[PDB]
Design a protein around this ligand. Structure first.
Ligand code: MG
Ligand code: MG
Ligand code: MG
Ligand code: MG
Ligand code: MG
Ligand code: MG
Ligand code: MG
Ligand code: MG
Ligand code: MG
Ligand code: MG
Ligand code: MG
Ligand code: MG
Ligand code: MG
Ligand code: MG
Ligand code: MG
Ligand code: MG
Ligand code: MG
Ligand code: MG
Ligand code: MG
Ligand code: MG
Ligand code: MG
Ligand code: MG
Ligand code: MG
Ligand code: MG
Ligand code: MG
Ligand code: MG
Ligand code: MG
Ligand code: MG
Ligand code: MG
Ligand code: MG
Ligand code: MG
Ligand code: MG
Ligand code: MG
Ligand code: MG
Ligand code: MG
Ligand code: MG
Ligand code: MG
Ligand code: MG
Ligand code: MG
Ligand code: MG
Ligand code: MG
Ligand code: MG
Ligand code: MG
Ligand code: MG
Ligand code: MG
Ligand code: MG
Ligand code: MG
Ligand code: MG
Ligand code: MG
Ligand code: MG
Ligand code: MG
Ligand code: MG
Ligand code: MG
Ligand code: MG
Ligand code: MG
Ligand code: MG
Ligand code: MG
Ligand code: MG
Ligand code: MG
Ligand code: MG
Ligand code: MG
Ligand code: MG
Ligand code: MG
Ligand code: MG
Ligand code: MG
Ligand code: MG
Ligand code: MG
Ligand code: MG
Ligand code: MG
Ligand code: MG
Ligand code: MG
Ligand code: ZN
Lengths: 104, 208, 83
RNA sequence: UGGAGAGUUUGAUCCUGGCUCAGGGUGAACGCUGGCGGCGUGCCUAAGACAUGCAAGUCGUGCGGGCCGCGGGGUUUUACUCCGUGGUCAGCGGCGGACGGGUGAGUAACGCGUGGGUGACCUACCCGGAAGAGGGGGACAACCCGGGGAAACUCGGGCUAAUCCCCCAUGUGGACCCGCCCCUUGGGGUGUGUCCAAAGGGCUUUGCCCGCUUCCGGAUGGGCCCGCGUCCCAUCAGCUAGUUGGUGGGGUAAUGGCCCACCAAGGCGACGACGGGUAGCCGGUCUGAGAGGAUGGCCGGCCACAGGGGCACUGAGACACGGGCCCCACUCCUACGGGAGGCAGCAGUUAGGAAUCUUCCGCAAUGGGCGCAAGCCUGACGGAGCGACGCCGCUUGGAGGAAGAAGCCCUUCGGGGUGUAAACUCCUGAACCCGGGACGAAACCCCCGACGAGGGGACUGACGGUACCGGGGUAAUAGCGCCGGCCAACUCCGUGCCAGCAGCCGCGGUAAUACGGAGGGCGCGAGCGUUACCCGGAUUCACUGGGCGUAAAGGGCGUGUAGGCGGCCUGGGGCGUCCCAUGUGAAAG
């Protein structure tokens, strides 16, 4: 069955396409503790119907481009930048960890 | 047979008659008579307390030397026995005892195992009416071990089966001195054998 | 096309064929689509040929073409017998 | 049903801790030794270069010819010319050459594994079903004539057949545009319009076989996509502009920046991007009590490659190991202009290396290609050859034989050991001789019968005069390592910190169980040792299963970002977690 995933829309700065951050949990193959790993999917949005913070379901689809092999199925719940925030900060935090100085 | 070389020198080293020569091993000449001490320039030297290891090494040698089997074969039988269901000690003894060359000794067609081994090789033996010249051949419950119909008149086979008249045989066996036929009734049990070996030390020897 | 032929499985001088359904292009001993019998040419045991007519007939009905030896055996087991 | 520990730091002790040994394993190699047989297995290095032969063809039931025969006609005779038939050669045409066989160079990747998706697709030959094949026209080889070249070959001119090319027709049907309907990402139906079919051949000839055409479907094989999993270095931290997305187009069987034009400004990264190193992945294999570690030869599946790089043509399928083009390196021929090649196919050569085989037999069997069939072709394969390289089986004898020969040997010189070992007696009888002698093969084929079911018959063995059976018949290879402790086994002599041993502890500077020899002994035995490498022991990276006061280990302290973690009660959800069913988990192992 076409895989259906649920995540948050982190990117919007794209034409007819939104980035969905999808998380998953699983026991560590050796150490047991449940660990959270995430992934961003570029999903199709022909009507530009979804925005940042929208928790949407994504479904496995016929390729729309390179990178785009998923389409936004439906909206699960909207508005919630608390999720977008983690992503943004975690993104900005990248300033500190490097060779060049940065007010991260 | 196997090893090929002074045999009574092994009984000597094992300090236990491993009865494997037929006569002589009864008559005051088994060397174990007026010569119980092991072979070599130091045979009568005051033996030093043996090591835990030396003890298991000699017990495994005493056993394997009794059947005249190579370490290659002994080990392969032990490993087979080990993984098999049931007390490995007995199962191991059960298997050793199932060797054709042994069953021939047990039925008296041969006075020793080395002789029995040669009889099997030279085709003088028959399992279920078919010639089987493999000393390692494994007899199974119900098999009939006879003397090859064409060897029934061999000067050696006569005197050997004559001596079996009136003579009792292993409870797990049975023979008809007339038709020179034997029967493997069942695998012997620990209690059925009277071996000068604590096979427990042998199991331990193979876990070192 | 897909065939019903013999795949070699014995050992040297100890041939034991395995009647299989496979594509014509595969190694004779490669990946088959289905085993539908076996055959011991030397007939070393009373059971030197089993076939499963049911199945042999399903493949025949969908295309499978048997080799000459394959059908010889399938027939010996009454795959084509219609009496 | 599954888990053994030992030596070694001190005068001695406990602990910490490393090193080392006992076990198992290997596409092995090396040394000493070496009898038989079965089954496996054998370039791990330079993916260095390759002489030679062989490794893919097949169809005369698709077609017309050339050369070499034999035979029959037209004729009063010759020339000339018509027909039939055999062999042979290529040609046109078709199916195969995209399989089978080889190697792992590249690749850290949807490459592989696993589970799914394709309303985004293809599939020659095979199977089922529906409908059909009416008429006309054309050309190019062969062949014939001529020209340029050393050759490879190449240019021109003329003739000709077809299941070769084209046109018109029939349109079951199918394709496309527009519309409507059902479905719902390009699935199915329907209406109008347009567009698209065909090949003939063979006779046990006036039917039946082989084949052709369009379409629906089956079966098999395949393309593409997605989740998850897949090594080391962070002394590699930023990366990217076809880059990320959009619209339109191109392209393909098909989705897609796959490619292109235009527009937007994106995308990716510490849950490790990018860069560097290494590496084909898997079923499995080895080891381990397990968790795990190591690995991927052989066999099976997938991928990738065919001297290095690029490219496309023909095809159902290839960007094509034994097809084509170009560039490069190289070998070769050369009349120097210019050409011919590519064993990572089998075998073999040469190079490199510690090291890896027969330029074998057969297509008898299984499998494959082509053919109606006969049959042809198959270094796939089935076998034999060489190598203890691995595994298993087996032999070098069996029973009797002194209070104990000779020699060697130690000796408190009295004896002690090798030793029932030998001699010798008797018994059997590996080798080898003679005789017989296979299974693997029954189909295809042909006859009967419907070219069906069914029945009947004949041909066919490389291995091989081998296996195996029977008769005859000689006592008839033994070696290697070790004996201070760990570690089973001790004595003499030579040597004198020498010569030399030595895995770790350590031996040897004159009584050495540790060197060398000898006797004796232990271990294993057609082998035994050695070196290398993997796992174990090693809870010595500790998830199971460890630590940090003084043994190695707390950050110099704080603030705080991400992240990890989170009190008591109730309720919803049900992601984590648990349960039932079910599908998948190829074969081999
Ligand atoms: Mg005889
Ligand atoms: Mg152990
Ligand atoms: Mg220690
Ligand atoms: Mg100290
Ligand atoms: Mg000391
Ligand atoms: Mg030699
Ligand atoms: Mg061999
Ligand atoms: Mg190689
Ligand atoms: Mg050549
Ligand atoms: Mg050939
Ligand atoms: Mg004539
Ligand atoms: Mg021809
Ligand atoms: Mg291949
Ligand atoms: Mg890389
Ligand atoms: Mg791919
Ligand atoms: Mg599909
Ligand atoms: Mg299909
Ligand atoms: Mg059809
Ligand atoms: Mg024409
Ligand atoms: Mg002509
Ligand atoms: Mg010319
Ligand atoms: Mg012309
Ligand atoms: Mg014409
Ligand atoms: Mg037309
Ligand atoms: Mg129509
Ligand atoms: Mg629709
Ligand atoms: Mg429609
Ligand atoms: Mg229509
Ligand atoms: Mg016709
Ligand atoms: Mg940027
Ligand atoms: Mg586009
Ligand atoms: Mg398209
Ligand atoms: Mg642009
Ligand atoms: Mg990298
Ligand atoms: Mg590589
Ligand atoms: Mg295992
Ligand atoms: Mg462990
Ligand atoms: Mg494992
Ligand atoms: Mg693995
Ligand atoms: Mg290999
Ligand atoms: Mg393989
Ligand atoms: Mg492929
Ligand atoms: Mg090459
Ligand atoms: Mg094409
Ligand atoms: Mg080639
Ligand atoms: Mg060399
Ligand atoms: Mg063949
Ligand atoms: Mg064939
Ligand atoms: Mg003797
Ligand atoms: Mg034939
Ligand atoms: Mg007829
Ligand atoms: Mg028949
Ligand atoms: Mg002798
Ligand atoms: Mg030592
Ligand atoms: Mg000792
Ligand atoms: Mg000296
Ligand atoms: Mg000395
Ligand atoms: Mg001294
Ligand atoms: Mg010495
Ligand atoms: Mg460990
Ligand atoms: Mg520690
Ligand atoms: Mg310290
Ligand atoms: Mg501190
Ligand atoms: Mg500091
Ligand atoms: Mg809580
Ligand atoms: Mg939390
Ligand atoms: Mg709750
Ligand atoms: Mg749940
Ligand atoms: Mg399940
Ligand atoms: Mg299942
Ligand atoms: Mg399996
Ligand atoms: Zn004795």
């Amino acid at each position: 069955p076409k895989k259906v995933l649920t995540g948050v829309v982190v990117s919007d700065k794209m034409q007819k396409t939104v980035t969905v951050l999808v998380e998953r949990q699983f026991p560590h193959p050796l150490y047991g503790k449940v660990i959270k790993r995430s992934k961003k999917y570029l999903a199709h949005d022909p009507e530009e119907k979804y925005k940042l913070g929208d928790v949407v379901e994504i479904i496995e689809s016929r390729p729309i481009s390179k990178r785009k092999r998923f389409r936004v199925l439906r909206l699960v719940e909207s508005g919630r930048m608390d999720l977008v925030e983690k992503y943004l900060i975690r993104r900005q935090n990248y300033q500190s960890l490097s060779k060049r100085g940065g007010k991260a | 047979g196997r090893y090929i070389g002074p045999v009574c020198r092994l009984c000597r080293r094992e300090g236990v008659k491993l009865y494997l020569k037929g006569e002589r091993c009864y008559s005051p000449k088994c060397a174990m008579e007026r010569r119980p001490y092991p072979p070599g320039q130091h045979g009568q030297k005051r033996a030093r307390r043996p090591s835990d290891y030396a003890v298991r090494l000699r017990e495994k040698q005493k056993l394997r030397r009794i059947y005249g089997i190579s370490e290659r074969q002994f080990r392969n039988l032990f490993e087979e026995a080990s993984k098999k269901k049931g007390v490995t000690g007995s199962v191991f003894l059960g298997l050793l005892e199932s060797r054709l060359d042994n069953v021939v000794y047990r039925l008296g067609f041969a006075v020793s195992r080395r002789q029995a081994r040669q009889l099997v090789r030279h085709g003088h033996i028959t399992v279920n009416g078919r010639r089987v010249d493999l000393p390692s051949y494994r007899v199974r419950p119900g098999d009939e071990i006879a003397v090859a119909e064409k060897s029934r008149n061999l000067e050696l086979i006569r005197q050997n089966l004559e001596a079996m008249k009136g003579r009792k045989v292993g409870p797990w066996l049975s023979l008809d001195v007339e038709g020179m036929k034997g029967k493997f009734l069942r695998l012997p049990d620990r209690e059925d054998l009277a071996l000068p070996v604590n096979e427990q030390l042998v199991i331990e020897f193979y876990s070192r | 096309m897909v065939k019903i032929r013999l795949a070699r499985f014995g050992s040297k001088h100890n041939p034991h064929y395995r009647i299989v359904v496979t594509d014509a292009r595969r190694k004779r001993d490669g990946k088959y689509i289905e085993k539908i019998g076996y055959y011991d040419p030397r007939k070393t045991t009373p059971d030197w040929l089993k076939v499963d007519v049911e199945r042999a007939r399903y493949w025949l009905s969908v295309g499978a073409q048997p080799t000459d030896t394959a059908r010889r055996l399938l027939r010996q087991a009454g795959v084509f017998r219609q009496e």
